[PDB]
Design a protein around this ligand. Structure first.
Ligand SMILES: [Zn+2]
Ligand SMILES: [Zn+2]
Lengths: 138, 138
């Protein structure tokens, strides 16, 4: 409980080339964008209800996203679950037998602390735990 | 606007075999299940915030889900956007050049009227428009 659907990450070769579909056809609001050269990605955030769609564009051929697109093609990359305490959640899923890609949280989009669960624990789905500092008002 | 993230459909070979992960490790609440022999699927609904995760298990080898698992493996199948008027939304995206799998709504899970957009219009992502009758209270 308190689990939220934070976002869905979507691998694309070009944010610019899909914005006409997302903004023009689906009528989602583009919140903004960010560069994350440490993960080799540029990201665009689209609002969908209380969640977001995160469009992930590779910055170089060595980007994990470029590798994903090469092996699997463009499409849905991961589902992020917003959690209250990422350290405790990692410890709990590990105690229950889940294999992690990230045993310790790492920097993700929007200054969030993130950790990816191994798809082999989840029948081929890539889940991300996402802990964000609570910010609203003014 | 008024777009909601209704659910994420996830293809699995067995609902029973993944419930330990979803309920035990991720601590999502299992809402219930349904058989949809017309789409050749059994479905389990897990609550995640205001959205759901929809686990799709094929009922036979001829199921579109069985075919998907055969060609792509288990993993994320589609993202459903809840809309207020599905007829008008289909007409609008078509006018904007989106190719539909379903030009007319068809019966989906939970008695919803649904229509799938063609992944070739959306860079390999399968989107579903989902219109549900509004039900709460008592
Ligand atoms: Zn993410
Ligand atoms: Zn669906």
């Amino acid at each position: 409980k308190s689990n939220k659907l934070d976002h869905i990450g979507i691998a694309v070769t070009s944010i610019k080339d899909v914005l006409p579909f997302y903004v023009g056809s689906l009528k989602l609001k583009l919140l903004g964008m960010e560069d994350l050269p440490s993960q080799g990605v540029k990201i665009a955030f689209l609002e969908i209800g209380e969640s977001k769609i995160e469009l992930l564009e590779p910055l170089s051929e060595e980007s994990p996203i470029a590798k994903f697109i090469q092996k699997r093609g463009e499409g849905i990359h991961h589902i992020a679950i917003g959690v209250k305490s990422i350290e405790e959640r990692i410890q709990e899923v590990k105690e229950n037998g889940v294999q992690m890609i990230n045993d310790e949280p790492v920097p993700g989009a929007r200054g969030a602390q993130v950790a990816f669960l191994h798809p082999r624990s989840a029948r081929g789905v890539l889940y991300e735990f996402c802990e964000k500092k609570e910010q609203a008002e003014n």
